[PDB]
């Protein structure tokens, strides 16, 4: 249904003269871009990462980012000077930005900033502003960033028009990968006495894993977290604490859209 496009930036300022800035980009749970500090240039991590942008557009868009990156770095450094000694390195800024797409030609866009791990600032409407909980001192940084009318129009253009446009193009070019089905594989194991159902290789992320005595879903099951594999598939496991000896006749039913109808049943 509702894909989210996410440009995650993370920058680290060690001291007055050492910084570094690295971004990666997601469409749902699939990486589309990656931009290393030591790269002058943004990298497609998918054949369709350029979207339905012509080259001209991409090159201008990328060039906007190339400039921003350099500009971003100095400004933080100057902002730390303006504040000091109230604030001092090491500093970690992180941005998260993009748009979420909906039925119709409908979308919300966001741009959230975080400082030392706490979400504090966002672009919203027409300007930056702090969110609830933020320190009052940010009011000077924010007053300054809001002085720059040129940045405001640009950011407003990226959020209101460019992101939804671009991401709408991405979803056309990516249909194949985005709608991929990969079949899970499963194995059983145990430890102190905990039965364990391993499931691995499945795409997309929704999946149902339950331990069962016959047709009776053993309710004590514990779903683990979704861990990724490197090939863009998922891994997940379900455990069941059981009295030693009671293993007989337990199965592990796994449901997935990959598996057209026929489920995976594993007996102990």
């Amino acid at each position, epitope marked *: 249904k509702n894909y989210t496009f996410r440009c995650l930036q993370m920058s680290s300022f060690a001291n007055r003269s050492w910084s570094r800035t690295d971004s990666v980009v997601w469409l749902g749970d699939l990486q589309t871009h990656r931009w290393s500090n030591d790269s002058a240039t943004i990298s497609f991590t998918k054949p369709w990462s350029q979207g339905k942008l012509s080259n001209q557009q991409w090159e201008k868009l990328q060039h906007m980012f190339q400039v921003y990156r350099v500009s971003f770095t100095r*400004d933080i450094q100057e902002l730390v000077k303006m504040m000091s000694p109230k604030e001092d390195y090491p500093i970690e800024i992180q941005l998260s930005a993009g748009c979420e797409m909906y039925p119709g030609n409908a979308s919300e866009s966001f741009l959230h900033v975080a400082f030392q791990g706490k979400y504090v600032v966002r672009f919203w409407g027409t300007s930056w502003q702090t969110v609830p909980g933020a320190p009052s001192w940010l009011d000077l940084p924010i007053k300054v960033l809001n002085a720059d009318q040129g*940045t405001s129009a640009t950011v407003q253009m990226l959020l209101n028009d460019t992101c939804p446009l671009f991401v709408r193009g991405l979803l056309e070019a990516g249909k194949s990968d985005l709608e991929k089905q990969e079949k899970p594989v499963a194995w059983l194991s145990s430890v102190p006495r905990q039965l364990v159902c391993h499931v691995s290789g499945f795409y997309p992320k929704p999946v149902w894993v339950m331990w069962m005595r016959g047709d009776q879903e053993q309710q004590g099951t514990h779903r683990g977290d979704f861990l990724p594999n490197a090939d863009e598939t998922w891994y997940l496991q379900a455990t069941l604490d059981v009295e030693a000896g009671e293993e007989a006749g337990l199965a592990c039913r796994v449901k997935h859209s990959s598996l057209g109808g026929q489920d995976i049943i594993l007996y102990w």
Partner: T-cell receptor
């Protein structure tokens, strides 16, 4: 939005202390010191973002800077030098981009 | 030298028109400002251009800016003797106090009376 500089003109000797003062009433957080030398633009020496701060600019060597207050940004030369013969310019501004320049001060450092 | 101006100097009979050129590599280029400096005095602003292609005027001074080309001009119509002065190009790299200004070395005008 005004900015003043004193002195406006100084003859000085190598080794002497020289102090160039700038003063502004506009309540401008930020203040800057440049020097103008034939065949270059103005180059920034020190600047300040408010009372208590001073930042190194593009050619800070030989100059120490002092912001005792919102009103005063002073440039100090502990050991003057013939190479510091120049025309010095102070500026202030608030959070936006315009910098309001002073009338300039002339320094001549003789042997 | 990210702000180059041209010509380094020029002489003109009062009444005549003249144009001054400023070329820059500065990045980014939020705004370009043309200052005027009388021999012995300090810096009077004449105009500041802010858009991608921009035109401005201040009495007998007009000016352009093309940001794609990174190029500005300054046209003085019908020069007067008081125009004898140095004209200085300045490029600001932000629309806030976070910016640094980058100064050309000016163009020395002399108007013959």
């Amino acid at each position: 939005a005004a900015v003043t500089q004193s002195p406006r003109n100084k003859v000085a000797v190598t080794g002497g202390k020289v102090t160039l003062s700038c003063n502004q009433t506009n309540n401008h957080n930020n203040m800057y010191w440049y020097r103008q030398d034939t065949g270059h633009g103005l180059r920034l020496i020190h600047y300040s973002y408010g009372a208590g701060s001073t930042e190194k600019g593009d050619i800070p060597d030989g100059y120490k800077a002092s912001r005792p207050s919102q009103e005063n940004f002073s440039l100090i030369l502990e050991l003057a030098t013939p190479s510091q013969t120049s025309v010095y310019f102070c500026a202030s501004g608030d959070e936006g981009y315009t910098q309001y320049f002073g009338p300039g001060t002339r320094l001549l450092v003789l042997e | 030298t990210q702000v180059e101006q041209s010509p380094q100097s020029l002489v003109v009979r009062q009444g005549e028109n003249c144009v001054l050129q400023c070329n820059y590599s500065v990045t980014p280029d939020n705004h370009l400002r043309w200052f005027k400096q009388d021999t012995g005095k300090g810096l009077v602003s004449l105009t500041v251009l802010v858009d991608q292609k921009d035109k401005t005027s201040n009495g007998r001074y007009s000016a352009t800016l093309d940001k794609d080309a990174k190029h500005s001009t300054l046209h003085i119509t019908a020069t007067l003797l008081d125009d004898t002065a140095t004209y200085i190009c300045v490029v600001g790299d932000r629309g806030s106090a976070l910016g640094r200004l980058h100064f050309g070395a000016g163009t020395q005008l002399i108007v013959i009376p």
